[PDB]
Design a protein around this ligand. Structure first.
Ligand code: NA
Lengths: 165, 80
């Protein structure tokens, strides 16, 4: 299995090109390992590095931020969520690249394209109960880069638990 | 009166009703979603027929008539 059945039955709605939403109900830790990330403002990029880079350290996220730069130069101008930033490409990059500046669903969308992966952000209440998932890319949960989002600004990395791979 | 009803399916899976005017700006419609659901306008991504709506337009600019279904998602990662 019912776990596998559950994960295989996620109901995704494409709300805009390449962005999908679902609202399964579950305790994130019943299906995923949480890999906790620092609360330093870089957690979005820490989480990505933990799942995409070998021998990840507390400084690996800088590489993700650089991929976010090259992603932005190709995709920022046409990203729907970029409209909410309200900054030119160059001013966005300067802000995005500054120390300890929050990453978000905007960078997730661009990194999905840049890294040729699917990124899912599961947003949870303080109980670690899922309120929604937002998926950038066309892949499924078993191959995606899964991020846990909580407390407005915090991201951790997620790995599917062995019994559900 | 001059008000119509529209539906908004939110990121949390809730299909809410909203009372609006065809002449309301996207900005005004966001403010109403703030009041009913508490999402800050700055954070909202209002979608209709696969397009994200822009703040200086009106519902009527998008041919949004009564009983229309919109999607509301919002940013994750930034303060509120
Ligand atoms: Na199972």
């Amino acid at each position: 299995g019912p776990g596998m059945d559950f994960l295989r039955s996620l109901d995704w709605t494409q709300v805009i090109a390449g962005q999908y939403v679902s609202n399964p109900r579950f305790n994130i830790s019943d299906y995923f390992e949480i890999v906790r990330q620092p609360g330093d403002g870089n957690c979005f990029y820490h989480s990505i590095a933990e799942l995409t880079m070998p021998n990840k350290t507390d400084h690996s996220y800088h590489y993700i931020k650089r991929l976010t730069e090259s992603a932005a130069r190709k995709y920022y101008q046409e990203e729907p969520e970029a409209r909410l930033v309200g900054l030119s490409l160059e001013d966005y990059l300067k802000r995005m690249l500054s120390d300890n500046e929050w990453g978000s669903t905007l960078e997730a969308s661009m990194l999905a394209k840049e890294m040729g992966i699917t990124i899912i952000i599961w947003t949870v209440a303080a109980s670690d109960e899922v309120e929604a998932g937002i998926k950038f890319g066309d892949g499924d949960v078993f191959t995606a880069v899964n991020l846990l989002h909580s407390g407005q600004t915090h991201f951790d990395a997620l790995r599917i638990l062995p019994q559900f791979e | 009166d001059d008000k119509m009803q529209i539906f908004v399916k939110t990121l949390t899976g809730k299909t809410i009703t909203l009372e609006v005017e065809p002449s309301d700006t996207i900005e005004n419609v966001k403010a109403k979603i703030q009041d009913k659901e508490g999402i800050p306008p700055d954070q909202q991504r209002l979608i209709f027929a696969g397009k994200q709506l822009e703040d200086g337009r009106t519902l009527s600019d998008y041919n949004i008539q009564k009983l229309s279904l919109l999607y509301l998602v919002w940013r994750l990662g930034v303060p509120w």
